Symmetry: C3
Subunit: 173 residues, 3 copies
């Protein structure tokens, strides 16, 4: 029938208008989402141990897990963010327009700057500060290059996931 929505320690999720929640999504406790968000199949927004704040027009893709460290870390996601399939976001701040590649893990006290890209499968170490409009890739996630301003977010994403950009020398997704 509908997404699993659930109170914990008296906190009840607050979801804005025009938000799509998949039938088998889970949103639990201290979670606020803005307007125009989508939460896809089997995604889990677990606000049991600390707070999750999500802005407007955020896409949380299938099988993604959002969690925090009890009294140590929080999630703040800004507007127009894309969180890829099977991503783990743990106690991270993600600024407006940032894209997190499918399969990535983003650890606590990470800041992803406005319009930055985390490549698919990256592991972003605790406390990593990702500059606005940069691409990070690998395990651990390292600076690859500035986002090309002459191209769109999506094409910058596609270029960041092409083997041509990591050829014979650079060994990071």
């Amino acid at each position: 029938k509908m997404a699993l929505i659930q109170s914990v320690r008296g906190f009840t999720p607050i979801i804005g208008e025009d938000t799509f929640l998949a039938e088998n999504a889970t949103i639990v406790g201290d979670v606020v989402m803005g307007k125009g968000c989508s939460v896809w199949f089997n995604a889990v927004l677990r606000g049991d141990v600390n707070s999750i704040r999500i802005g407007d027009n955020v896409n949380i893709q299938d099988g993604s897990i959002l969690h925090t460290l009890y009294q140590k870390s929080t999630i703040e996601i800004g507007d127009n963010v894309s969180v890829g399939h099977n991503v783990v976001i743990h106690g991270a701040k993600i600024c407006d327009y940032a894209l997190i590649g499918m399969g990535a893990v983003v650890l606590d006290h990470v800041v992803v700057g406005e319009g930055a890209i985390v490549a698919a499968g990256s592991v972003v170490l605790t406390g990593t500060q990702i500059e606005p409009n940069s691409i990070y890739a690998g395990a651990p996630a390292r600076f690859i290059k500035k986002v090309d301003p002459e191209q769109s977010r999506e094409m910058n994403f596609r270029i960041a996931h092409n083997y041509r950009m990591y050829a014979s020398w650079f060994k990071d997704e």
Copy 2:
């Protein structure tokens, strides 16, 4: 209770005979599967923005995500393919008897050679062409070694053949 099956843009999943769908699997939109397939716990096949085509005796293991790019990529998976636990396949072509290792990410316009093996946890970048009968590994995935065609088509077929037996213990209540 059974699998979440839904249409999107009027496309309705089509499933061959003798196909196991776990009751918490999700199959949505433009998905076509052959017969002898198995779709495991919390697998998601999301054909909402482009097409997913799957041959026979394919297992999609627990927590695996199949998705595509709007007007840009499609998924084509051959027969006797094993897709591991928590794998993401995005707009890729997987030929017969290929095995995708658990936790791997396979990106758009990738072609996985017949009898090939993507190692657990690999990230295969866009327009990687994986040689048949070869093992790829790492992030980005790179050529590690050849396997004999004999042991590699047979070996990957046996994983897919046993998976049909594991499916029937749930599907047929055996």
Copy 3:
């Protein structure tokens, strides 16, 4: 309404007292867990092809998959173990007080020693023997350092102890 729990070939899950099973967890076949365990959202314990044995006060976090190889590998998980979000455990032994970091893959015949830690996102190759009180990281996962045995056990104990408290907020 509640967790998917099912027999396969006559093997029926056995769950200890005081154990939290999330409404969308899956526990199937030859699985035994002890007391004070928590299985979180969309976790899958698939005991269809071989045994899964889990001791007391173990948390299996959201999205994690536990499976085996038919006739070939088993899962044995000791007491006070924390298994991170979106982890895959395939046919591995995890000893008391061990942590598996989120996003990690742990393959068949791996042994994770008492009080050892697998870093987030590691891939532990088939057969890797992880020393007690050691940190392994990377893909393939490699030795990083020793940790003090008494500190590692008490820290990892307190992570498993907090998880039992988080579980009690959902009961």
